[PDB]
Amino acid sequence: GLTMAEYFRDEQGQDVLLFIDNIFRFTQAGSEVSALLGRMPSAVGYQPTLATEMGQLQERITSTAKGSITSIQAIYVPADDYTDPAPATTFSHLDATTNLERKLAEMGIYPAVDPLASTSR
């Protein structure tokens, strides 16, 4: 998806959106092969090359002098534990968060974006 999106930024000079269903799964998949490649494990049974992989992915979406790619990514936190290595690693690349609340959807507010929990830099 990233290489499909980069063509429009670099050749047509457009501003593109890139949606990612679950970034977490990405990192998870890596660990599932790491031990089979013959690598010693790091904390919580993750691959030693975790931040390098996430950085090599997330650094390709930027705003150059021609166009830009902006990415909306949905993240699942395992058991709502925000100190897990994967959410902790991916949270250092984010600029804003958008929280959707069922309380505002019940009362008839569309979209259900929470105004007191959404943050931006």
Binding site: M40, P48, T49
Partner: peptide, 18 residues
Amino acid sequence: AAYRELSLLLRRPPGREA
């Protein structure tokens, strides 16, 4: 974290939190 990654890839014995 970068130093830990280098050390684990070189097969040096780990410790607390690797």
